[PDB]
């Protein structure tokens, strides 16, 4: 959601008058792994993930 | 209103419908948000 | 959510292809009909020169 | 942001006129040092 | 129908005549009234619903004068001619008898700011249909204060689209062309002014080029436009560079290289040179460079390049650098760069005993012994006759005797410490290659 309405917000800066759509595919094939750490714990999370 | 470090995230798999003319706008903001990646496509072929 | 993101990505592609499109047709045939009615000029041009 | 636009164009040509330009003044500026390094000695000759 | 003429109906354009249909009154007490007649009230009432009815609509548009029920009835007309479930019949209701014509464009050109544009939607429509030119309403039309000063108001862009995109929408018809140029004194360069700022952005950016490259199709009206205003023409080059959108820059590229056409024989060549003089071959170039993705600009885009290149042999003509000679003043053009591209007219320069050299001595002696190093001309001048007195003496080093017997040996030494930038680097190029020259 977050990331359309930034597209949107640019589009309407852009002035390009054509809207900008996105859908979610079947997602069959493996999607990476995330970790949204902050600076108190990225240390350990690295050094886990080595 | 967002994940954490419980497990990894909630992955997801979106269809990016760029306009041909805004290519470069859109890509350049879009890899200013430091959110996305993007799916290795159309590398059969040399570089 | 699916009902409105499917209107508005119809309403993208629209506005995307078919008005675009239209535009850059009735373009393409106005520059048509201006270079038909150029070239006619060069036929009848050439043709005026060979009656005379 | 501010992106670029066509100003990515005109950092170009800014570059390959700055490269131009410098050339020039660096071959300039090794030419006359090689100029006044052989007049130095000549100028203390006699 | 002949032709829709919708042209998106972009903000304004429908959200009145929405309002205008929302607003509906069955105007039944109006014929109480005595405003509108049994016919008028039966208009109306058909009307409200969302061949011989045309008659009494312009009856009472002409007798009634509320102008409310006249807004009413634009509203109604237009909307009529615009739907398609009658509008064939609506518009062959003046493909079967356009003498009303005349009288609907004295009914259309009447109304407030709001309402003229209203009418105006229908009397472009029924102008713009195959049935019916009426050159002499389109010039009518033409003559209106009240659209010309909409279509002037560039400040209500929302509202100055539906008077621009009108225009172009009317200006498709080749016999109106004639007219719409000879009042265009008018009305462009307001259209060239929308241009010079830069979805309503956007399209009146699109639908104003085109009014200016459909009108510039004939090469007649398009020397004119070349000539009375050469700033905007020069300046299309850099919207074109600037545009985001493919459209507006490949209506751009094809209205330039229609002006530079082999047409127009007044400045066939002399536009193109004057552009190339407007620092117009590197933009060329760097769109050459660019990746359009459209094959017909891309196209437009390799044969103004080409036409470019050909014209480059301006350089090439050691005549036209004897003739920038005998000008008092030379201009930063491709000359400036004929003897780094071919060298052969150097022998031309060494020859007379040093003839070119002295006249270019000369020039930069009378441009220093009056000063004005500040002034741009002047400023420019002198950077060109430098840079072309650089060129020629690193390239023959017998005429480094021929500068000192004239005193430019000092001169350009003295004009080291110009005032302005460019001169003074101009200035210690050229020193350093005579200096360096004569080292040997």
Not at chain 5, 21 to 42: K, N, P, Y
Not at chain 5, 346 to 364: A, G
Request: net charge negative; proline share 3%.
């Amino acid at each position: 959601a977050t990331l359309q309405a930034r597209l949107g917000e640019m589009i309407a800066r852009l002035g390009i008058d054509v809207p900008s759509i996105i859908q979610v595919l079947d997602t069959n094939h493996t999607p990476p792994t995330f970790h949204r750490t902050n600076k108190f714990t990225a240390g350990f999370q690295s050094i886990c993930d080595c | 209103k967002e994940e954490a470090i419980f497990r990894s995230a909630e992955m997801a798999l979106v269809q990016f419908y760029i306009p041909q003319e805004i290519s470069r706008d859109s890509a350049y903001t879009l890899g200013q948000l430091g959110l996305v990646q993007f799916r290795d496509l159309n590398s059969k072929v040399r570089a | 959510l699916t009902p409105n993101q499917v209107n508005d990505e119809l309403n993208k592609m629209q506005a995307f292809i078919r008005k675009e499109a239209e535009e850059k047709a009735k373009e393409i045939q106005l520059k048509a009909d201006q270079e038909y009615e150029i070239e006619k000029t060069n036929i009848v041009r050439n043709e005026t020169n060979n009656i005379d | 942001v501010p992106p670029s636009g066509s100003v990515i164009d005109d950092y170009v040509r800014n570059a390959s006129y700055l490269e131009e330009r410098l050339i020039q003044m660096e071959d300039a500026t090794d030419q006359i040092e090689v100029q006044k390094n052989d007049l130095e000695q000549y100028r203390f000759i006699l | 129908m002949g032709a829709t003429k919708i042209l998106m109906d972009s903000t304004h354009f429908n959200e009145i005549r929405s309002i205008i249909r929302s607003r509906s009154v069955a105007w039944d007490a109006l014929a109480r009234s005595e405003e509108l007649s049994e016919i008028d009230a039966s208009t109306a009432k058909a009307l409200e619903s969302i061949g011989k009815t045309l008659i009494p609509l312009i009856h009472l548009l002409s007798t009634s004068d509320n102008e409310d029920c006249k807004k009413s009835v634009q509203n109604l007309i237009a909307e009529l001619l615009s739907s398609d479930k009658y509008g064939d019949d609506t518009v062959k209701f003046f493909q079967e008898d356009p003498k009303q014509l005349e009288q609907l464009f004295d009914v259309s050109l009447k109304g407030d700011f709001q309402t003229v544009l209203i009418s105006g939607f229908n009397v472009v429509s029924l102008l713009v249909q195959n049935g019916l030119h009426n050159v002499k309403l389109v010039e009518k039309l033409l003559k209106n204060n009240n659209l010309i000063n909409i279509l002037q108001n560039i400040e209500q862009m929302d509202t100055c689209y539906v008077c621009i995109r009108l225009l172009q929408e009317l200006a498709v018809i080749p016999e109106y062309r004639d007219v719409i140029w000879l009042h265009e004194k008018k009305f462009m360069p307001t259209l060239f002014k929308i241009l010079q700022r830069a979805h309503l952005g956007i399209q009146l950016q699109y639908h104003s080029l085109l009014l200016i490259w459909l009108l510039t199709f004939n090469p007649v009206f398009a020397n004119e436009l070349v000539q009375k205003y050469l700033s905007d023409f020069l300046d299309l080059l850099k919207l074109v560079k600037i545009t985001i959108k493919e459209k507006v820059s490949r209506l751009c590229i094809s209205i330039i290289l229609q002006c530079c056409s082999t047409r127009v024989k007044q400045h066939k060549k002399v536009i193109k040179q004057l552009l190339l003089l407007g620092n117009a071959l590197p933009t060329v170039q760097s769109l050459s460079e660019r990746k359009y993705s459209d094959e017909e600009l891309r196209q437009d885009i390799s044969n103004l390049k080409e036409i470019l290149e050909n014209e480059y042999q301006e350089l090439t003509s050691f005549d036209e650098y004897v003739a920038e000679l005998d000008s008092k003043l030379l201009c930063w053009s491709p000359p400036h760069v004929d003897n780094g591209f071919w060298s052969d007219n150097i022998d031309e320069f060494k020859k007379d005993n040093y003839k070119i050299f002295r006249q270019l001595i000369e020039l930069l002696q009378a441009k220093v012994r009056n000063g004005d190093v500040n002034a741009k001309q002047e400023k420019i001048i002198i950077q060109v006759a430098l840079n072309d007195i650089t060129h020629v003496v690193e390239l023959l080093p017998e005429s480094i005797d021929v500068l000192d017997k004239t005193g430019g040996k000092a001169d350009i030494m003295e004009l080291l410490n110009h005032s302005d930038s460019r001169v003074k680097y101009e200035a210690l190029k050229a020193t350093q290659a005579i200096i360096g020259y004569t080292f040997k």
